[PDB]
Amino acid sequence: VLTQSPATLSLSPGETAIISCRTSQYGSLAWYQQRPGQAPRLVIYSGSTRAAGIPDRFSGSRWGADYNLSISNLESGDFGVYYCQQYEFFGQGTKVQVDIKRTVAAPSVFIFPPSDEQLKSGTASVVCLLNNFYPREAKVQWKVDNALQSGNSQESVTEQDSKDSTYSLSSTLTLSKADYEKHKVYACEVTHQGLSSPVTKSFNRGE
Amino acid sequence: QVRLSQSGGQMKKPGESMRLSCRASGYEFLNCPINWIRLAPGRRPEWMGWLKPRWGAVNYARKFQGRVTMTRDVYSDTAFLELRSLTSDDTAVYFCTRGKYCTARDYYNWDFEHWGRGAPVTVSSASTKGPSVFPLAPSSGGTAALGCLVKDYFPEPVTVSWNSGALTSGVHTFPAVLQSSGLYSLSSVVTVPSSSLGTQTYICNVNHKPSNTKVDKRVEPK
Amino acid sequence: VWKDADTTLFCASDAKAHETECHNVWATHACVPTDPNPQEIHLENVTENFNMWKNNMVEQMQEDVISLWDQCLQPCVKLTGGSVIKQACPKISFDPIPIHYCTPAGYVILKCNDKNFNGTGPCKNVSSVQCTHGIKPVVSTQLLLNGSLAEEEIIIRSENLTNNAKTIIVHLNKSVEINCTRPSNDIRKAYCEINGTKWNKVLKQVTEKLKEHFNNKTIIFQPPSGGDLEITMHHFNCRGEFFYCNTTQLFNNTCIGCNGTITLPCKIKQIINMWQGTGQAMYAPPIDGKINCVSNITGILLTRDGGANNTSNETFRPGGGNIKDNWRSELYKYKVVQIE
Ligand SMILES: *[C@@H]1O[C@H](CO)[C@@H](O[C@@H]2O[C@H](CO)[C@@H](O[C@@H]3O[C@H](CO[C@H]4O[C@H](CO[C@H]5O[C@H](CO)[C@@H](O)[C@H](O)[C@@H]5O)[C@@H](O)[C@H](O)[C@@H]4O)[C@@H](O)[C@H](O[C@H]4O[C@H](CO)[C@@H](O)[C@H](O)[C@@H]4O)[C@@H]3O)[C@H](O)[C@H]2NC(C)=O)[C@H](O)[C@H]1NC(C)=O
Ligand SMILES: *[C@@H]1O[C@H](CO)[C@@H](O[C@@H]2O[C@H](CO)[C@@H](O[C@@H]3O[C@H](CO[C@H]4O[C@H](CO)[C@@H](O)[C@H](O)[C@@H]4O)[C@@H](O)[C@H](O[C@H]4O[C@H](CO)[C@@H](O)[C@H](O)[C@@H]4O)[C@@H]3O)[C@H](O)[C@H]2NC(C)=O)[C@H](O)[C@H]1NC(C)=O
Ligand SMILES: *[C@@H]1O[C@H](CO)[C@@H](O[C@@H]2O[C@H](CO)[C@@H](O[C@@H]3O[C@H](CO)[C@@H](O)[C@H](O)[C@@H]3O)[C@H](O)[C@H]2NC(C)=O)[C@H](O)[C@H]1NC(C)=O
Ligand SMILES: *[C@@H]1O[C@H](CO)[C@@H](O)[C@H](O)[C@H]1NC(C)=O
Ligand SMILES: *[C@@H]1O[C@H](CO)[C@@H](O)[C@H](O)[C@H]1NC(C)=O
Ligand SMILES: *[C@@H]1O[C@H](CO)[C@@H](O)[C@H](O)[C@H]1NC(C)=O
Ligand SMILES: *[C@@H]1O[C@H](CO)[C@@H](O)[C@H](O)[C@H]1NC(C)=O
Ligand SMILES: *[C@@H]1O[C@H](CO)[C@@H](O)[C@H](O)[C@H]1NC(C)=O
């Protein structure tokens, strides 16, 4: 029915975004834009027609089953996720996000052991912060007594800071109080474009 | 002008049912269908069905037949949706929509120009729960990072400020994450000078309105 | 020479002064006599585009019929908003007669004589007429009654078949009588008889026809999913009384026993929802004595289940709730054009 591509699109202000949609049927195709936490807005219909309040920058075109939506001169407001539609059917969506270009900045790395208060509840969370870095790609590597930890943690990233254009990431490794008290050396190893070599911030349990 | 006033979002458990209203205004309510569409984060949008307000004729998507009911009140231009036998798949933001072409002579349903604000519906077997706020104490360039770990709360959202809002510089509150337990958890960090860990006091003000719990957690070096 | 245009049409009929029936009187007051010798001139080497779903004739007929009901089917009370305007509720001798629609000077109706013409697209056997054929303004849901038949094969009509929001009109090429009765001496309970064999043969033919517009997908009928009784049931008027009939047995997928006489449960209501627009109307309790209406079923109004992703099925449900489509089912072959 409707195959929409690509899944994601990371672009800087000024560039042009080209989202594609493949149909197998025919009839009025439309494009919608959804900004984080808001209702979708009709952007284009009949494949080529702009809606009210939509500027020249947005344009659509067609070839057989293929439909493109083209957004020239991207700006902050334009970023979000886009959907194609044919009658009642929708595409899987394409997330278009903002990456304002800037000079490379290495992460500040901090590690936090579990608080005593948390340990008292019979659970333990080790937190690793990567502060103010660019670009957004980065890798966190948990190690417990030099043992690589695969699948015991969760990451979370802020959106690009409006003031300095950096990113921050937080990684949380969770364990049973007994497991936490089984081992000694808790290490967080960070790799990034700004680091000539991986950086390991660490600590020993109960010190 | 055309305004689709929706009823607010709600919290549901699996097996319960939900009811949503959408008030139409600014146009003749009988002229064109009213549609219901759900949007789940990271998932293909799902048209549920339309209702033609004149007789209340409906067309329900195959997926929902039996579970869904669409009615309306012509005397007050309000549309109604009920969804029964909820599971966690029914967690989405439910909208009511109306096409652009809408005249007494003709309509085109599927160019959704008008949307309601939305109604976030979450379906989980988790009950409401206040968060536990644990310190992320600093240790020893010339800056130290400290913060709050806000663990095990349901549902969203929770709000975090520092020193009653008097400290906004270098503050990063992270997007909460959903643990396999079903509860949520987020961290909020802040960078400060190293020459202040013994002078300036740092308090993390966490407020979780649903459970009505407020915590002023003081973060200090261990 | 000519170009598409919208004007104000005038009506013609065979209404007589001695007939006191309501629609007849209306026609003596609103219409001119039917032209005794109608001349239909054929147009040679002419192809023209018709569009039954964009035809002002429908709008005019709608306003006329609204007027007609306004002066003939006067309800006892009308519940608006709001107010509750009460009024007089006489006995109603109502039985629809054929009305012809005619163009004023400078205009002329073009007619499509293509046998299997579906209502939109080019027609290559166009002719010129001054008047439509006689059209009875018969207001009904799910089933189209006492209309004209398709001249050759069964015809599926839709503004766009893939748009589930669009009504589907099935035009039959052979009608099937429906015999509705309310006995004398519960005075609201009635029934409708249909020859099972005929109806099932016809339905078979419409499924096999629908199958051609859906690339050999399995075709399934189902009862309505919701809505007012006027739309979830076969709703019509007989002898001034308002009938509602359960048509479930009419759309039985298995029957393609089930070949005897199909008998439908019916009900006569006094509190109805007005098709004219918003509001309920109350009518006086049913008259006494046997009430009987025998009608010809000429068309069916369908709605296709949307969201039908995957599957090898397509599901259709009766009705169909916009009376303008009743008018379109008759006016499909005409269009008004201006000269010069
Ligand atoms: C419900 O509504 C829908 C429409 O809303 C109906 O779908 C269509 O109906 C008609 C009649 O059958 C046909 O419409 C087509 O429109 C095209 C014009 O669109 C513009 O964009 C084109 C993009 O490229 C298309 O054409 C090129 C060739 O020029 C093809 O290579 C390409 O695959 C695209 O099809 C532009 O090129 C064009 O200039 C327009 O600006 C027409 O191009 C198209 O031509 C058809 O017929 C040609 C032969 O005469 C044939 O060569 C083409 O391939 C094409 O089939 C056509 O007029 C569609 O055919 C039809 N749907 C389809 C299959 O696309 C739908 O019918 C209706 N539902 C029902 C049941 O009635
Ligand atoms: C679809 O189309 C068909 C016709 O093609 C319509 O069928 C007509 O229905 C109307 C209304 O039901 C019928 O009108 C009635 O005709 C009767 C005729 O009486 C016969 O017998 C008497 C003796 O009793 C003779 O004098 C007469 O000549 C006839 O042989 C009347 O009985 C009916 O009522 C009359 O008397 C009562 C008395 O109380 C009055 O209240 C009435 O106002 C009226 O004076 C009535 O006139 C008509 O006969 C049908 N036509 C045919 C030939 O079948 C369908 O109605 C239509 N369907 C829909 C849904 O529109
Ligand atoms: C009413 O309309 C229907 C069509 O919707 C007519 O039924 C159709 O009848 C034709 C022949 O008149 C059939 O076509 C023939 O099929 C055979 C079988 O392969 C073939 O040998 C012939 O060449 C021809 O193509 C057609 O199958 C049939 N359609 C359906 C759906 O059954 C019917 O005849 C019409 N009735 C009246 C009263 O005019
Ligand atoms: C945009 O759409 C056109 C029409 O199908 C297509 O040919 C083109 O490849 C698309 N753009 C890009 C960058 O591929
Ligand atoms: C009606 O018939 C015409 C014949 O040209 C065809 O083009 C059109 O698609 C048909 N419309 C529908 C929806 O039946
Ligand atoms: C209509 O049905 C009634 C009641 O069953 C019957 O007496 C009458 O003969 C029928 N009329 C026709 C035309 O078949
Ligand atoms: C029902 O309809 C068929 C159509 O062929 C007809 O031949 C038959 O006599 C009718 N039978 C009954 C039960 O009246
Ligand atoms: C119609 O008939 C079926 C079975 O005869 C019954 O279940 C249903 O409630 C009736 N009424 C409607 C409006 O479907």
Side-chain angles (χ1 to χ4, degrees), chain A, chain B residues 2-222, chain C:
Chain A
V1 211
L2 291 187
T3 56
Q4 194 177 333
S5 67
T8 62
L9 204 47
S10 195
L11 296 174
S12 315
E15 300 180 284
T16 69
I18 293 81
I19 306 170
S20 288
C21 195
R22 188 178 304 277
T23 71
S24 59
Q25 312 288 324
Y26 184 46
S28 314
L29 182 139
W31 293 98
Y32 300 87
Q33 179 204 14
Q34 183 184 22
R35 303 177 174 98
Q38 296 192 352
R41 57 190 284 221
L42 178 67
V43 153
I44 280 192
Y45 63 98
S46 305
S48 309
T49 309
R50 288 185 296 271
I54 309 291
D56 294 346
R57 314 185 298 103
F58 295 87
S59 71
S61 55
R62 178 183 190 216
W63 202 234
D66 302 315
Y67 282 84
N68 293 12
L69 165 67
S70 157
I71 308 170
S72 59
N73 297 274
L74 270 56
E75 60 180 63
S76 57
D78 305 338
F79 301 94
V81 6
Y82 289 83
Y83 299 111
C84 64
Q85 178 220 4
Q86 200 175 27
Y87 298 126
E88 3 114 359
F89 307 96
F90 291 81
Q92 315 75 13
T94 290
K95 192 192 179 318
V96 189
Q97 51 196 34
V98 65
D99 168 46
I100 299 177
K101 272 144 176 46
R102 77 182 299 292
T103 59
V104 165
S108 296
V109 193
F110 306 89
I111 182 160
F112 301 98
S115 61
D116 295 328
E117 185 178 16
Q118 180 182 196
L119 289 168
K120 189 184 308 298
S121 63
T123 54
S125 293
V126 189
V127 178
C128 185
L129 172 69
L130 286 59
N131 215 221
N132 302 77
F133 63 82
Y134 190 93
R136 122 173 286 178
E137 293 65 23
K139 183 59 179 176
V140 178
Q141 198 69 304
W142 283 104
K143 307 179 72 172
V144 181
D145 281 327
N146 191 31
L148 174 61
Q149 301 302 316
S150 94
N152 293 24
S153 59
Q154 287 164 357
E155 292 179 342
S156 174
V157 187
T158 57
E159 295 297 328
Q160 182 177 36
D161 187 278
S162 59
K163 177 181 286 187
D164 62 26
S165 311
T166 62
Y167 295 86
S168 292
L169 178 151
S170 188
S171 187
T172 302
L173 176 93
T174 303
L175 298 94
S176 77
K177 179 187 179 275
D179 292 333
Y180 175 69
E181 289 187 324
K182 243 69 164 297
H183 302 276
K184 275 278 177 55
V185 188
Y186 293 84
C188 174
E189 178 194 351
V190 176
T191 63
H192 182 235
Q193 179 179 342
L195 299 170
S196 53
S197 67
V199 167
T200 309
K201 294 291 187 183
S202 60
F203 73 91
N204 298 353
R205 188 194 63 109
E207 290 187 349
Chain B
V2 188
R3 289 297 215 278
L4 297 191
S5 309
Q6 275 197 244
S7 55
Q10 46 196 248
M11 199 190 326
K12 290 298 181 181
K13 285 169 177 293
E16 297 179 355
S17 77
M18 77 176 186
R19 294 183 167 175
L20 302 175
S21 73
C22 173
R23 177 83 89 109
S25 58
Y27 75 102
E28 178 55 51
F29 189 50
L30 310 190
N31 291 351
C32 55
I34 271 292
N35 305 261
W36 289 97
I37 320 182
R38 57 143 78 148
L39 284 78
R43 192 117 68 85
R44 196 193 294 268
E46 248 169 347
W47 170 87
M48 295 181 64
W50 55 248
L51 169 140
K52 292 168 179 192
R54 175 189 320 271
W55 291 117
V58 294
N59 189 337
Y60 300 146
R62 173 66 69 216
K63 191 188 183 71
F64 297 119
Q65 296 184 13
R67 307 171 51 210
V68 72
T69 295
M70 295 182 183
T71 55
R72 91 296 187 202
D73 181 348
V74 291
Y75 294 93
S76 66
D77 296 330
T78 316
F80 302 105
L81 167 100
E82 186 189 50
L83 187 61
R84 289 177 297 277
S85 300
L86 298 170
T87 75
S88 51
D89 300 34
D90 301 317
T91 297
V93 184
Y94 293 80
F95 294 93
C96 60
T97 63
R98 202 221 74 171
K100 173 189 185 57
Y101 193 24
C102 199
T103 67
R105 183 183 264 78
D106 200 333
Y107 62 86
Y108 185 76
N109 187 42
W110 312 99
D111 283 340
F112 301 137
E113 187 187 17
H114 300 109
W115 294 70
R117 67 181 174 186
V121 166
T122 176
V123 184
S124 163
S125 57
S127 300
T128 55
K129 179 183 174 297
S132 292
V133 186
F134 303 117
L136 297 179
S139 61
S140 290
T143 71
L146 53 89
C148 283
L149 176 51
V150 184
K151 248 191 70 70
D152 290 331
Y153 69 92
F154 194 84
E156 297 263 44
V158 78
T159 177
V160 171
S161 73
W162 282 97
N163 292 2
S164 305
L167 176 52
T168 62
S169 299
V171 165
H172 290 140
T173 296
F174 287 81
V177 291
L178 182 60
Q179 305 161 149
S180 63
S181 58
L183 310 181
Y184 282 105
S185 174
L186 65 82
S187 302
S188 179
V189 308
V190 57
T191 55
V192 294
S194 301
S195 58
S196 59
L197 274 67
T199 99
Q200 176 68 277
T201 193
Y202 298 108
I203 306 179
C204 179
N205 306 92
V206 174
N207 183 16
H208 182 247
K209 298 179 182 181
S211 66
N212 201 258
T213 68
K214 283 191 290 295
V215 171
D216 296 340
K217 192 44 147 288
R218 177 166 168 174
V219 181
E220 52 190 21
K222 188 61 183 178
Chain C
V1 183
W2 72 83
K3 50 182 288 302
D4 297 10
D6 286 16
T7 175
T8 295
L9 305 170
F10 69 93
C11 68
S13 64
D14 288 14
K16 307 307 181 192
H18 72 271
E19 185 55 275
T20 66
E21 181 268 315
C22 201
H23 186 208
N24 182 92
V25 174
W26 184 96
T28 73
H29 294 353
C31 298
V32 302
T34 298
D35 184 65
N37 185 253
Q39 290 290 341
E40 174 184 347
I41 144 185
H42 171 77
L43 274 58
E44 195 173 1
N45 279 322
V46 177
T47 299
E48 258 260 341
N49 288 96
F50 293 80
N51 189 334
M52 53 171 301
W53 311 100
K54 283 280 129 62
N55 194 345
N56 192 93
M57 300 180 68
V58 174
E59 312 293 334
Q60 186 154 5
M61 194 178 288
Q62 173 79 358
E63 279 292 345
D64 284 335
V65 176
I66 286 184
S67 162
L68 167 66
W69 276 58
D70 218 323
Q71 93 172 49
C72 284
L73 275 307
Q74 308 186 27
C76 298
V77 302
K78 276 182 296 187
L79 298 204
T80 61
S83 62
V84 177
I85 304 165
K86 305 163 284 291
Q87 55 182 15
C89 208
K91 189 219 172 187
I92 36 193
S93 195
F94 179 70
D95 182 30
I97 74 178
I99 306 307
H100 302 260
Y101 278 84
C102 303
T103 50
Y107 298 85
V108 53
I109 306 187
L110 299 177
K111 193 217 294 176
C112 186
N113 304 285
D114 285 28
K115 299 310 181 65
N116 299 332
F117 180 66
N118 65 10
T120 70
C123 184
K124 55 187 60 182
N125 192 338
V126 186
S127 60
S128 161
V129 304
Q130 311 304 316
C131 278
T132 73
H133 67 293
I135 302 161
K136 290 145 74 76
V138 188
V139 178
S140 62
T141 62
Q142 299 193 359
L143 274 15
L144 300 176
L145 280 359
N146 297 347
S148 61
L149 299 173
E151 40 276 80
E152 268 212 355
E153 64 190 9
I154 299 189
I155 295 179
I156 304 305
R157 304 193 148 94
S158 179
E159 189 165 356
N160 196 276
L161 270 177
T162 54
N163 186 0
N164 72 62
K166 295 309 181 188
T167 318
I168 301 174
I169 301 187
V170 181
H171 212 238
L172 307 178
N173 67 338
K174 165 174 291 182
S175 69
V176 172
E177 286 186 14
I178 177 174
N179 194 349
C180 301
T181 338
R182 199 225 58 183
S184 306
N185 296 74
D186 190 18
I187 63 170
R188 289 179 307 191
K189 181 56 180 62
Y191 59 95
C192 278
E193 297 186 346
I194 305 187
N195 193 328
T197 308
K198 294 180 182 178
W199 171 256
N200 291 327
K201 182 181 180 63
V202 168
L203 237 209
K204 228 298 207 310
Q205 288 178 337
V206 329
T207 59
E208 199 171 352
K209 197 68 180 180
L210 236 28
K211 221 162 169 292
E212 301 172 353
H213 296 92
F214 295 101
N215 59 87
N216 293 2
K217 223 148 181 147
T218 306
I219 264 65
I220 265 68
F221 286 100
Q222 291 290 312
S225 303
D228 297 336
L229 287 171
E230 290 81 13
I231 209 273
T232 59
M233 278 165 81
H234 180 16
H235 170 67
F236 62 95
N237 189 269
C238 180
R239 301 264 179 84
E241 307 300 342
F242 291 96
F243 287 75
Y244 297 73
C245 309
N246 194 337
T247 51
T248 287
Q249 312 176 52
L250 249 44
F251 300 93
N252 195 343
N253 305 267
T254 55
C255 288
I256 53 93
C258 291
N259 68 333
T261 286
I262 302 177
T263 152
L264 277 25
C266 283
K267 212 71 170 60
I268 296 178
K269 284 169 53 68
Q270 293 71 59
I271 299 167
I272 77 170
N273 295 294
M274 289 178 295
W275 61 266
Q276 285 96 307
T278 178
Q280 288 182 323
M282 191 183 84
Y283 290 86
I287 83 173
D288 301 327
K290 181 171 65 65
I291 295 171
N292 174 239
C293 257
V294 181
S295 308
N296 283 305
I297 298 174
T298 59
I300 310 177
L301 302 177
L302 298 172
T303 307
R304 188 173 58 78
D305 277 344
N309 173 33
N310 233 283
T311 71
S312 31
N313 272 325
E314 282 295 346
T315 300
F316 300 84
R317 310 186 194 273
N322 183 27
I323 314 303
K324 292 190 186 178
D325 294 329
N326 289 20
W327 316 147
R328 290 190 175 93
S329 81
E330 291 302 301
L331 295 170
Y332 72 90
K333 61 165 59 184
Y334 305 106
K335 66 177 294 199
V336 179
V337 300
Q338 184 175 323
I339 306 298
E340 260 66 275

Short mmCIF file of all heavy atoms in Angstrom, two decimals, chain A residues 105-132:
data_model
loop_
_atom_site.label_atom_id
_atom_site.label_comp_id
_atom_site.label_asym_id
_atom_site.label_seq_id
_atom_site.Cartn_x
_atom_site.Cartn_y
_atom_site.Cartn_z
N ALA A 105 32.88 19.42 20.02
CA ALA A 105 33.10 19.57 21.45
C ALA A 105 33.01 18.23 22.17
O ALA A 105 32.02 17.52 22.06
CB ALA A 105 32.10 20.55 22.04
N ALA A 106 34.07 17.89 22.90
CA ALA A 106 34.16 16.66 23.66
C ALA A 106 33.25 16.70 24.90
O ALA A 106 32.99 17.77 25.44
CB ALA A 106 35.60 16.38 24.05
N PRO A 107 32.75 15.53 25.32
CA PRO A 107 31.86 15.40 26.47
C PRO A 107 32.59 15.59 27.79
O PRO A 107 33.70 15.10 27.92
CB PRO A 107 31.38 13.95 26.39
CG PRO A 107 31.73 13.47 25.03
CD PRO A 107 32.95 14.24 24.65
N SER A 108 31.97 16.27 28.75
CA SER A 108 32.46 16.15 30.11
C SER A 108 31.82 14.92 30.75
O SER A 108 30.61 14.77 30.73
CB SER A 108 32.12 17.40 30.92
OG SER A 108 32.77 18.53 30.40
N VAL A 109 32.62 14.05 31.33
CA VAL A 109 32.09 12.78 31.80
C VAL A 109 32.15 12.71 33.31
O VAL A 109 33.18 13.00 33.93
CB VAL A 109 32.84 11.59 31.19
CG1 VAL A 109 32.06 10.30 31.44
CG2 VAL A 109 33.06 11.82 29.70
N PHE A 110 31.02 12.35 33.91
CA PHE A 110 30.92 12.21 35.36
C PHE A 110 30.25 10.88 35.70
O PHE A 110 29.31 10.49 35.02
CB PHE A 110 30.11 13.35 35.95
CG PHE A 110 30.61 14.70 35.57
CD1 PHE A 110 30.15 15.32 34.42
CD2 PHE A 110 31.54 15.36 36.34
CE1 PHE A 110 30.61 16.57 34.05
CE2 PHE A 110 32.00 16.61 35.99
CZ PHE A 110 31.54 17.21 34.84
N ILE A 111 30.74 10.19 36.72
CA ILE A 111 30.05 8.99 37.17
C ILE A 111 29.55 9.14 38.61
O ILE A 111 30.22 9.73 39.46
CB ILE A 111 30.95 7.73 37.04
CG1 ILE A 111 30.20 6.47 37.47
CG2 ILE A 111 32.25 7.90 37.82
CD1 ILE A 111 30.81 5.19 36.94
N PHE A 112 28.35 8.62 38.86
CA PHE A 112 27.71 8.67 40.16
C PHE A 112 27.38 7.27 40.66
O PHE A 112 26.67 6.51 39.97
CB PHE A 112 26.42 9.48 40.08
CG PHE A 112 26.63 10.89 39.62
CD1 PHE A 112 26.40 11.23 38.29
CD2 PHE A 112 27.02 11.88 40.50
CE1 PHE A 112 26.59 12.52 37.85
CE2 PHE A 112 27.20 13.18 40.07
CZ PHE A 112 26.99 13.50 38.74
N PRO A 113 27.89 6.91 41.85
CA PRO A 113 27.53 5.66 42.51
C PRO A 113 26.13 5.76 43.08
O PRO A 113 25.60 6.87 43.20
CB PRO A 113 28.54 5.58 43.67
CG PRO A 113 29.56 6.62 43.39
CD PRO A 113 28.86 7.68 42.63
N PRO A 114 25.51 4.61 43.38
CA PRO A 114 24.19 4.62 44.00
C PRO A 114 24.23 5.27 45.38
O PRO A 114 25.19 5.09 46.12
CB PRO A 114 23.86 3.13 44.15
CG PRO A 114 24.72 2.45 43.14
CD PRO A 114 25.98 3.24 43.11
N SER A 115 23.18 6.01 45.72
CA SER A 115 23.08 6.62 47.02
C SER A 115 22.83 5.53 48.05
O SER A 115 22.32 4.46 47.71
CB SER A 115 21.95 7.65 47.04
OG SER A 115 20.70 7.02 46.75
N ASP A 116 23.19 5.78 49.31
CA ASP A 116 22.92 4.82 50.37
C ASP A 116 21.41 4.61 50.53
O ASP A 116 20.94 3.50 50.78
CB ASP A 116 23.52 5.29 51.68
CG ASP A 116 25.03 5.35 51.63
OD1 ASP A 116 25.63 4.53 50.91
OD2 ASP A 116 25.62 6.22 52.31
N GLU A 117 20.67 5.70 50.35
CA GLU A 117 19.22 5.68 50.49
C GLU A 117 18.57 4.70 49.51
O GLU A 117 17.65 3.97 49.87
CB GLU A 117 18.64 7.08 50.31
CG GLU A 117 17.14 7.16 50.56
CD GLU A 117 16.59 8.57 50.43
OE1 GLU A 117 17.29 9.43 49.86
OE2 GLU A 117 15.46 8.81 50.90
N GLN A 118 19.09 4.67 48.29
CA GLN A 118 18.59 3.76 47.27
C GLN A 118 18.98 2.33 47.60
O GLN A 118 18.16 1.42 47.47
CB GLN A 118 19.09 4.16 45.88
CG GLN A 118 18.60 3.25 44.78
CD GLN A 118 19.15 3.63 43.42
OE1 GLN A 118 18.63 3.20 42.39
NE2 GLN A 118 20.20 4.45 43.42
N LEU A 119 20.22 2.13 48.01
CA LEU A 119 20.71 0.80 48.38
C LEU A 119 19.85 0.20 49.49
O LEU A 119 19.66 -1.01 49.54
CB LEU A 119 22.18 0.85 48.80
CG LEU A 119 23.17 1.12 47.68
CD1 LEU A 119 24.55 1.43 48.24
CD2 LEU A 119 23.21 -0.11 46.79
N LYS A 120 19.36 1.07 50.37
CA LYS A 120 18.49 0.63 51.45
C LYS A 120 17.18 0.02 50.93
O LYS A 120 16.57 -0.81 51.60
CB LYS A 120 18.18 1.82 52.37
CG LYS A 120 17.46 1.46 53.65
CD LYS A 120 17.11 2.71 54.44
CE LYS A 120 18.33 3.60 54.65
NZ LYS A 120 19.39 2.92 55.44
N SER A 121 16.77 0.41 49.72
CA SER A 121 15.53 -0.09 49.12
C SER A 121 15.76 -1.41 48.38
O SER A 121 14.83 -2.01 47.84
CB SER A 121 14.91 0.94 48.17
OG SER A 121 15.75 1.24 47.07
N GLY A 122 17.02 -1.85 48.32
CA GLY A 122 17.38 -3.12 47.74
C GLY A 122 17.59 -3.10 46.23
O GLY A 122 17.51 -4.13 45.56
N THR A 123 17.89 -1.91 45.70
CA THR A 123 18.20 -1.74 44.28
C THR A 123 19.34 -0.73 44.14
O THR A 123 19.60 0.06 45.05
CB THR A 123 16.97 -1.26 43.45
OG1 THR A 123 16.40 -0.07 44.02
CG2 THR A 123 15.90 -2.35 43.36
N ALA A 124 20.02 -0.76 43.00
CA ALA A 124 21.17 0.11 42.81
C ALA A 124 21.25 0.66 41.39
O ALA A 124 21.24 -0.10 40.42
CB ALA A 124 22.45 -0.63 43.16
N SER A 125 21.34 1.98 41.28
CA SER A 125 21.50 2.62 39.98
C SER A 125 22.80 3.40 39.91
O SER A 125 23.05 4.29 40.73
CB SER A 125 20.33 3.57 39.69
OG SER A 125 19.11 2.86 39.53
N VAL A 126 23.62 3.05 38.92
CA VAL A 126 24.85 3.77 38.65
C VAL A 126 24.60 4.69 37.48
O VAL A 126 24.14 4.24 36.43
CB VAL A 126 26.01 2.81 38.30
CG1 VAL A 126 27.31 3.58 38.24
CG2 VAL A 126 26.11 1.70 39.34
N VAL A 127 24.90 5.98 37.64
CA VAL A 127 24.59 6.96 36.59
C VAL A 127 25.83 7.57 35.95
O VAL A 127 26.72 8.03 36.65
CB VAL A 127 23.67 8.08 37.09
CG1 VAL A 127 23.41 9.09 35.99
CG2 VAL A 127 22.36 7.51 37.60
N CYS A 128 25.87 7.62 34.63
CA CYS A 128 26.99 8.23 33.93
C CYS A 128 26.50 9.39 33.06
O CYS A 128 25.67 9.21 32.17
CB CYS A 128 27.72 7.19 33.08
SG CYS A 128 29.20 7.80 32.26
N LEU A 129 27.00 10.59 33.34
CA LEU A 129 26.63 11.78 32.59
C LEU A 129 27.69 12.19 31.57
O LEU A 129 28.88 12.26 31.89
CB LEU A 129 26.37 12.95 33.54
CG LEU A 129 26.16 14.31 32.85
CD1 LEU A 129 24.86 14.34 32.08
CD2 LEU A 129 26.20 15.43 33.87
N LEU A 130 27.23 12.45 30.35
CA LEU A 130 28.06 13.02 29.31
C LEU A 130 27.50 14.40 29.00
O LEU A 130 26.44 14.52 28.38
CB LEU A 130 28.02 12.16 28.05
CG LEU A 130 28.75 10.82 27.99
CD1 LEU A 130 28.30 9.83 29.06
CD2 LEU A 130 28.62 10.22 26.59
N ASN A 131 28.21 15.44 29.41
CA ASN A 131 27.70 16.80 29.38
C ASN A 131 28.27 17.61 28.21
O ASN A 131 29.47 17.55 27.94
CB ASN A 131 27.93 17.50 30.72
CG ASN A 131 26.82 18.45 31.09
OD1 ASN A 131 27.06 19.55 31.59
ND2 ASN A 131 25.58 18.03 30.84
N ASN A 132 27.40 18.38 27.55
CA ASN A 132 27.76 19.37 26.53
C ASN A 132 28.76 18.89 25.48
O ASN A 132 29.93 19.27 25.50
CB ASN A 132 28.29 20.65 27.18
CG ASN A 132 27.29 21.28 28.13
OD1 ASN A 132 27.10 20.80 29.25
ND2 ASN A 132 26.64 22.34 27.68
#
